[PDB]
Write a protein that binds this ligand. Structure first.
Ligand SMILES: COCCn1cc(-c2cnc(N3CCOCC3)c3nc(COc4ccc5ccccc5n4)cn23)cn1
Ligand SMILES: [Mg+2]
Ligand SMILES: [Zn+2]
Length: 312
């Protein structure tokens, strides 16, 4: 059904840009993921029938929430695409496959509630996945969907190669738990500076991949402003929707998840960039220099928030 698709020539060149925006090509998002895989791992790392089967199932299990939904998955997948394409040598054939799948499934069957909420109100997900709650569920879902009839796109890997690819996927879905980013960047940051970072060192390698994921995951901040500005709202609908349930249970939510403090949105976003996004994209560039356009777009949108906060 999908299989017969081919991307328009108008988009081939734009799709390679880091600041590419999938937004006005909704009914092509699956096609673009077929595209980004064929361009990266060639047209014969997955049987086309099995890839298309898998993507549409991935789509199915993305809910109709405001931010953590199928649009957000593809956008992330795209960033990693642009990262991988700009640093083609540095990552193994096997890693390229995993990181393009892992991104796509990184928020699979997401409920639009944080781990804070799922843990504060004792959700069964928090009963099972004690830390990194939603992030563990997300990987879980990749497993089941892979085990579905005719979905195992990796089935052509050796038994050992198969297990390596799941590890990579699992590690990269967990690293998108922002709680782990701070420590991950902190440790990356020192390794590079104290001069001990080493691609060859597999534990070192995993952190590079984890930060990559965090860069792709938040990459809405790296687009043209009228995209970035629109995307900001999407996250807040979700956040405030969380707060609102808390309130219906007698509980006051924190400012970010309280729609009565929406006049502070620029304030939050300006502080988010400075506390999270900028450091992320600084350490990504420092380690992966040709991926610098991200940091550049992140700054651009930062001063756009400045402009707003002080009224221009
Ligand atoms: C506990 O919530 C889950 C963990 N968490 C997620 C975030 C977070 C993630 N992504 C954000 N993006 C990516 C998409 O483009 C918009 C920015 C993000 N923005 C924020 C905004 O930060 C705040 C902080 C305090 C605020 C207080 C009042 C009004 C707005 C605020 N925004 C938090 N996150 C912060 N903590
Ligand atoms: Mg997540
Ligand atoms: Zn995400």
């Amino acid at each position: 059904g999908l299989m017969q698709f081919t991307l328009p020539v108008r988009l081939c060149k734009e799709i390679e840009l880091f600041h590419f925006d999938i937004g006005p090509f909704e009914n092509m998002w699956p096609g673009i993921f077929v595209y980004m895989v064929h361009r990266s791992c060639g047209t014969s790392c997955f049987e086309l029938e099995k890839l298309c089967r898998f993507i549409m199932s991935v789509k199915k299990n993305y809910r109709r929430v405001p931010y953590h939904n199928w649009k957000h998955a593809v956008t992330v997948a795209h960033c990693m695409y642009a990262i991988l394409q700009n640093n083609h040598t540095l990552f193994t054939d096997l890693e390229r496959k995993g990181l393009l799948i892992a991104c796509l499934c990184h928020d699979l069957d997401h409920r639009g509630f944080s781990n804070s909420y799922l843990q504060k109100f004792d959700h069964p997900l928090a009963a099972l996945y004690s830390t990194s709650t939603m992030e563990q569920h997300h990987f879980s879902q990749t497993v089941s969907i892979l085990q579905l009839e005719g979905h195992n796109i990796f089935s052509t890997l050796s038994s050992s190669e198969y297990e390596q690819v799941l590890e990579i996927i699992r590690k990269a879905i967990i690293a998108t738990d922002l709680a782990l980013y701070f420590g991950n960047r902190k440790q990356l940051e020192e390794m590079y500076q104290t001069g001990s970072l080493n691609l060859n060192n597999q534990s070192h390698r995993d952190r590079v991949i984890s930060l990559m994921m965090t860069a792709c995951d938040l990459c809405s901040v790296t687009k043209l402003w009228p995209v970035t500005k629109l995307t900001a709202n999407d996250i807040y609908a979700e956040f405030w929707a969380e707060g609102d349930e808390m309130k219906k249970l007698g509980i006051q939510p924190i400012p970010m998840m309280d729609r009565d403090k929406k006049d502070e949105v620029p304030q939050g976003q300006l502080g988010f960039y400075n506390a999270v996004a900028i450091p992320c994209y600084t350490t990504l560039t420092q380690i992966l220099p040709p991926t610098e356009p991200l940091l550049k777009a992140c700054r651009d949108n930062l001063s756009q928030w400045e402009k707003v906060i002080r009224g221009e």
